[PDB]
Write a protein that binds this ligand. Sequence first.
Ligand SMILES: CC(C)CCC[C@@H](C)[C@H]1CC[C@H]2[C@@H]3CC=C4C[C@@H](OC(=O)CCC(=O)O)CC[C@]4(C)[C@H]3CC[C@]12C
Ligand SMILES: CC(C)CCC[C@@H](C)[C@H]1CC[C@H]2[C@@H]3CC=C4C[C@@H](OC(=O)CCC(=O)O)CC[C@]4(C)[C@H]3CC[C@]12C
Lengths: 60, 60
Amino acid sequence: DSETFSTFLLDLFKLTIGMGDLEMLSSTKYPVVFIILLVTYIILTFVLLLNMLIALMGET
Amino acid sequence: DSETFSTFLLDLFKLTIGMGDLEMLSSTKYPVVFIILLVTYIILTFVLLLNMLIALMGET
Ligand SMILES: CC(C)CCC[C@@H](C)[C@H]1CC[C@H]2[C@@H]3CC=C4C[C@@H](OC(=O)CCC(=O)O)CC[C@]4(C)[C@H]3CC[C@]12C
Ligand SMILES: CC(C)CCC[C@@H](C)[C@H]1CC[C@H]2[C@@H]3CC=C4C[C@@H](OC(=O)CCC(=O)O)CC[C@]4(C)[C@H]3CC[C@]12C
């Protein structure tokens, strides 16, 4: 399923930029857990990982 | 009205992400107060709550 992964990765990175739509989830079973996982992914990427990068510069 | 709440919550969280549109307000009376409330919600979520999280890491 290399092609599916290749397409989805571009879509996921675009969603990470803040632009796009998660229309691909129609084929997924148990959509709730996918929503939760994407929620936590966004939270980690934006709140914790990005903030720590901010903090490091200030202290150095 | 559990179903309406379930749908609206997803829409509201999506708006919190910065993507989506607030098309659901057509059925609402006194739209102005709804606009104001969403304004203050966004202000608190982005300006004050998010900033305090930034500040805490720097001081620790
Ligand atoms: C966060 C940092 C540390 C990681 C760097 C991110 C890259 C690994 C991501 C960002 C955008 C991604 C790319 C988005 C689009 C494509 C084209 C894709 O091949 C295609 O041309 C089919 C899809 C298309 O044509 O758009 C193969 C993966 C690639 C290079 C993706 C692979 C991984 C990339 C470079
Ligand atoms: C800011 C932090 C501390 C709170 C965490 C946010 C979650 C409580 C929000 C974010 C996205 C929300 C979800 C968006 C979509 C859905 C599916 C929804 O049920 C449906 O499948 C119908 C709507 C649809 O299929 O899209 C029930 C609520 C849920 C899990 C929402 C409930 C609450 C969630 C998980």
